[PDB]
Amino acid sequence: RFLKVKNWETDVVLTDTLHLKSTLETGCTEHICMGSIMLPTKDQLFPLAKEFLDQYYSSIKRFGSKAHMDRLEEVNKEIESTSTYQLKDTELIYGAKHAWRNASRCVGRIQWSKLQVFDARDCTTAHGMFNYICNHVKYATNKGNLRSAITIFPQRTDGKHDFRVWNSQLIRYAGYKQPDGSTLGDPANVQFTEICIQQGWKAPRGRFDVLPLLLQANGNDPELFQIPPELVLEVPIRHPKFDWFKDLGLKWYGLPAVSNMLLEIGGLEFSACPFSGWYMGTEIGVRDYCDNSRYNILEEVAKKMDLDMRKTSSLWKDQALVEINIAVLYSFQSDKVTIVDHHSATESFIKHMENEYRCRGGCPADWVWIVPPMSGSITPVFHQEMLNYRLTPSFEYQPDPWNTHVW
Amino acid sequence: RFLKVKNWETDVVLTDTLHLKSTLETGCTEHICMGSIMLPVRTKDQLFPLAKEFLDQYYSSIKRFGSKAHMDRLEEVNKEIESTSTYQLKDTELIYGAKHAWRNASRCVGRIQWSKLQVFDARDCTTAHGMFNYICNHVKYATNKGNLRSAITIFPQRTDGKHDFRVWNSQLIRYAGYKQPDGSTLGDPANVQFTEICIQQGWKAPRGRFDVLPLLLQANGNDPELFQIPPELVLEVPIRHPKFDWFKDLGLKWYGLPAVSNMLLEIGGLEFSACPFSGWYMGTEIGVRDYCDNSRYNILEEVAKKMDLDMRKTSSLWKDQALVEINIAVLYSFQSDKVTIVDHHSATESFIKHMENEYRCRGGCPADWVWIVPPMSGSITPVFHQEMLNYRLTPSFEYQPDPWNTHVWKG
Numbered sequence: 001r002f003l004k005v006k007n008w009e010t011d012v013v014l015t016d017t018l019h020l021k022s023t024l025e026t027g028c029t030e031h032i033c034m035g036s037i038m039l040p041t042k043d044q045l046f047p048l049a050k051e052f053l054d055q056y057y058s059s060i061k062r063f064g065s066k067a068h069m070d071r072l073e074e075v076n077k078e079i080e081s082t083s084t085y086q087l088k089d090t091e092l093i094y095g096a097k098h099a100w101r102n103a104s105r106c107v108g109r110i111q112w113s114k115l116q117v118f119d120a121r122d123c124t125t126a127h128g129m130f131n132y133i134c135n136h137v138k139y140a141t142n143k144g145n146l147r148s149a150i151t152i153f154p155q156r157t158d159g160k161h162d163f164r165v166w167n168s169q170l171i172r173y174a175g176y177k178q179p180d181g182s183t184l185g186d187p188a189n190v191q192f193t194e195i196c197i198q199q200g201w202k203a204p205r206g207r208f209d210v211l212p213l214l215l216q217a218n219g220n221d222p223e224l225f226q227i228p229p230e231l232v233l234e235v236p237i238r239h240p241k242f243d244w245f246k247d248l249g250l251k252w253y254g255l256p257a258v259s260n261m262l263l264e265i266g267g268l269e270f271s272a273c274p275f276s277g278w279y280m281g282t283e284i285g286v287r288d289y290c291d292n293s294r295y296n297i298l299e300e301v302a303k304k305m306d307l308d309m310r311k312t313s314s315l316w317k318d319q320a321l322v323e324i325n326i327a328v329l330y331s332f333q334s335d336k337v338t339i340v341d342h343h344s345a346t347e348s349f350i351k352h353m354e355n356e357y358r359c360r361g362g363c364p365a366d367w368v369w370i371v372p373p374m375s376g377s378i379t380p381v382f383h384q385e386m387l388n389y390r391l392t393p394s395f396e397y398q399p400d401p402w403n404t405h406v407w
Numbered sequence: 408r409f410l411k412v413k414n415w416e417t418d419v420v421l422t423d424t425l426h427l428k429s430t431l432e433t434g435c436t437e438h439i440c441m442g443s444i445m446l447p448v449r450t451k452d453q454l455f456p457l458a459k460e461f462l463d464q465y466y467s468s469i470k471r472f473g474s475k476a477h478m479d480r481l482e483e484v485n486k487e488i489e490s491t492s493t494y495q496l497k498d499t500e501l502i503y504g505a506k507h508a509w510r511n512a513s514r515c516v517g518r519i520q521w522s523k524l525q526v527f528d529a530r531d532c533t534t535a536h537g538m539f540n541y542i543c544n545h546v547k548y549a550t551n552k553g554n555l556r557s558a559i560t561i562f563p564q565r566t567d568g569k570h571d572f573r574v575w576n577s578q579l580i581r582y583a584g585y586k587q588p589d590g591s592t593l594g595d596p597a598n599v600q601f602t603e604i605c606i607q608q609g610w611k612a613p614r615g616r617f618d619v620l621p622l623l624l625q626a627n628g629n630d631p632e633l634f635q636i637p638p639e640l641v642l643e644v645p646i647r648h649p650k651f652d653w654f655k656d657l658g659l660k661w662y663g664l665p666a667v668s669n670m671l672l673e674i675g676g677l678e679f680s681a682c683p684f685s686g687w688y689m690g691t692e693i694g695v696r697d698y699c700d701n702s703r704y705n706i707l708e709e710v711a712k713k714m715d716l717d718m719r720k721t722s723s724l725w726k727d728q729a730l731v732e733i734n735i736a737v738l739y740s741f742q743s744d745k746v747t748i749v750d751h752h753s754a755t756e757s758f759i760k761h762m763e764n765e766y767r768c769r770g771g772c773p774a775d776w777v778w779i780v781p782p783m784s785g786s787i788t789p790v791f792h793q794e795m796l797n798y799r800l801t802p803s804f805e806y807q808p809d810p811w812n813t814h815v816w817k818g
């Protein structure tokens with residue numbers, strides 16, 4: 001019921017007590033570990049509301065004070081009569097920062113408390129949403145000096161009136177199926193790209209076409225909007241020694257902003273809550289460029305480096321993977337767009353884990369996601385035991401809205 | 408209950424029914440996953456059900472479930488258990504048993520080979536000298552002048568846990584580690600503790616960077632004894648690089664035969680506390696972990712200097728660059744000297760096919776993603792993209808405590 005985690009590179013040993021306040025379920029049993037699976041009422045709402053305010057008031061050292069009990073009565077009162085309730089600003093800010101704090105898949109959490117929260121609960125329309133969104137994109141982009149932010153749309157009510165950003169990220173490239181069999185652009189987005197055109201988008205049909213936003217306000221059909229180009233900071237990708245690299249004509253966007261997750265604070269569900277930080281290099285260079293089901297450029301790059309592709313044992317895919325990632329980090333740096341390499345991002349996360357053990361009694365963490373997808377064991381997180389558990393408030397996955405939405 | 412695992416690269420979904428046949432706990436609960444945690448005397452009463460379960464599996468695999476030969480073996484094991492408090496495996500059962508322990512080994516990416524495993528039965532062994540002789544023959548047979556062959560050697564099972572056979576080495580061939588007075592380590596820091604023990608037991612240490620350790624062998628619960636493996640039986644490979652001529656001058660070599668000697672093999676409830684087994688290396692085991700862990704030979708800095716990489720900012724990926732060249736060199740050196748080795752692309756690709764075949768034919772393949780995914784270039788190998796279910800089948804290889812921590816010394 002108290003647990004040890006050990007780092008096998010440093011023999012440092014940490015004691016987790018924070019898992020005892022774990023709420024949700026992992027997907028694992030004593031018989032079977034699912035640690036590698038990607039996706040593993042008035043009466044319901046009150047316990048949730050309670051548990052949350054208890055967390056809040058304890059954090060500001062007013063646990064069991066007049067103001068505590070009072071707000072607790074107030075929220076019951078509201079639950080009893082409205083069937084939902086509304087968070088104060090301070091609770092909304094706390095709830096969101098804590099949801100990032102509890103995101104066990106997130107290596108970037110040393111930054112958790114500096115989150116800038118934009119309260120968009122007064123929004124009513126997709127045009128409204130589009131405005132909030134551009135203001136978020138501009139504030140977080142900050143001409144390259146990126147800053148954490150989240151924008152929070154109104155919470156669900158009857159689930160017939162949901163706010164949803166249909167895009168999976170605010171800024172992503174289109175995917176088009178082609179006559180020859182293959183795919184132009186980004187294969188991950190192929191289906192959303194069909195939906196845009198099927199909702200009315202004129203697509204330019206290139207390799208790096210910034211998708212339009214598809215926004216659903218208050219349960220209505222969603223609407224199309226094009227993000228002002230001047231707000232999409234993009235980096236052309238070159239290499240500090242390979243001349244011919246720029247002739248692949250690769251570019252990437254500077255602002256990663258996940259837009260399809262659900263935020264749960266004290267039993268309340270915020271289905272549209274786009275958030276953003278900045279990239280660790282490997283995300284683009286290893287996954288976006290090199291996954292077979294993504295841009296998949298390893299073959300071409302190795303072709304230009306004149307490496308021996310005649311057998312796997314020359315490690316040509318590995319040599320190329322390195323140079324590709326050198327060319328992402330260098331390009332972003334040369335243009336001064338915040339970016340972090342996997343080495344210092346992981347070292348920071350170790351520091352963050354230590355802090356969290358010391359001050360909070362633990363730090364939930366999902367090893368499978370924290371260890372970068374190249375050079376794993378030469379980052380310190382590889383040697384670090386982690387405990388994974390689900391704390392609230394949290395970010396949750398939710399089904400792609402087109403599967404749910406009724407027209 | 409059926410369980411689905413998706414490969415996110417290919418969209419292949421597979422259905423696991425095999426996890427139903429599962430016994431031992433995982434370490435995880437519904438409230439916590441311990442999937443990254445490294446390590447999360449038996450009564451008559453509890454022995455017969457285990458015996459029985461195993462024999463049921465056995466007779467099913469040879470298509471004689473419920474036969475007279477099956478029923479009689481049950482009854483004969485039952486009777487032996489009641490009368491002697493333990494029981495003896497037939498040869499055929501032991502072979503089947505050791506093979507399955509390998510097939511069930513969820514952290515092993517090499518399992519496509521499971522069915523081609525040479526089992527040497529050393530259950531007639533009585534002494535340490537007897538052990539050394541068995542081990543030597545294992546090393547020579549498995550080495551096979553560089554064309555490696557997988558093999559395991561099985562010493563007598565535990566009885567009252569006061570007469571245990573153990574190999575005190577963690578691998579049969581491994582290199583000394585020596586802590587110097589200045590705090591530095593000469594050789595392999597993984598093996599310093601065991602190296603001290605050897606010296607204390609009377610080993611005269613050469614004290615170089617690559618001294619093959621002597622064997623430390625315990626028979627019948629007796630104090631263990633030292634033996635030098637004959638050097639002619641120790642296949643070693645100097646490491647060089649196909650393009651970097653200064654690479655030989657780092658003075659690196661490695662041994663060709665990886666042979667884990669500290670695990671416990673469990674079959675039908677019986678415990679074989681000494682069962683060294685060997686296969687061959689995947690290149691990343693040496694080139695990433697053995698050479699480049701900070702707590703092992705730690706050569707990254709030295710290789711990066713010699714490459715003249717920019718080491719001022721980690722964002723040069725000088726570490727990633729050096730690491731690839733080192734793994735190239737390990738693969739190149741082994742292939743040149745005709746010693747079996749496998750790269751992590753080829754190994755993980757093989758494992759994927761093994762895994763899919765295991766689902767079709769067995770209804771599952773327990774796998775530990777944390778271990779199966781290589782420690783470099785994870786996502787460009789297809790396992791990274793493969794959902795896996797981890798659960799504990801028997802027969803199995805288990806961890807056991809280091810014997811110096813448990814052994815009662817005779818004097």
Ligand code: HEM
Nearest residue numbers: 100103105106107108111148149275276277278279280395
């Ligand atoms: C500030 C710099 C940040 C860095 C460097 C960073 C880094 C990362 C990385 C590398 C991942 C894995 C992503 C993937 O493999 O697709 C991730 C996942 C995640 N991050 Fe962070 N992050 C940052 C900020 C944030 C913020 C501001 C939030 C929320 C406020 C957040 C919440 C999450 C969540 C919920 C996941 C898992 C997402 C999923 O399951 O797809 N991150 N992060």
Ligand code: HEM
Nearest residue numbers: 509512514515516517520557558684685686687688689804
């Ligand atoms: C045939 C060639 C083989 C290859 C390429 C192979 C590959 C590997 C690799 C790379 C590992 C991870 C090792 C580490 O990180 O230290 C491993 C683990 C393991 N393998 Fe295999 N293996 C082979 C043969 C065998 C055999 C013959 C057995 C038993 C009969 C076996 C049983 C295991 C076990 C029990 C583990 C986990 C060890 C631990 O928990 O420390 N392997 N294997």
Ligand SMILES: C[C@H](O)[C@H](O)[C@H]1CNc2nc(N)[nH]c(=O)c2N1
Nearest residue numbers: 036037038368369791792793794
């Ligand atoms: C099957 C496996 O769970 C899947 O490939 C995971 C592995 N680790 C990951 N880690 C990160 N950071 N992001 C990912 O998308 C994934 N994918």
Ligand SMILES: C[C@H](O)[C@H](O)[C@H]1CNc2nc(N)[nH]c(=O)c2N1
Nearest residue numbers: 382383384385443444445777778
């Ligand atoms: C904490 C963590 O589980 C530990 O570093 C594991 C990670 N994955 C591994 N994977 C393999 N194959 N071998 C190892 O020794 C390890 N070490």
Ligand SMILES: CSCCCC(=N)NCCC[C@H](N)C(=O)O
Nearest residue numbers: 256257258277278279280283284
């Ligand atoms: C967006 S919030 C998490 C912090 C931002 C980030 N660094 N990445 C997360 C998802 C982006 C995805 N891996 C990609 O390569 O586009």
Ligand SMILES: CSCCCC(=N)NCCC[C@H](N)C(=O)O
Nearest residue numbers: 665666667684685686687688692
């Ligand atoms: C003996 S069991 C598996 C067959 C041999 C093997 N391929 N790996 C075992 C572990 C070797 C260790 N990782 C090392 O680098 O020495």
Ligand SMILES: [Zn+2]
Nearest residue numbers: 028033435440
């Ligand atoms: Zn688990």
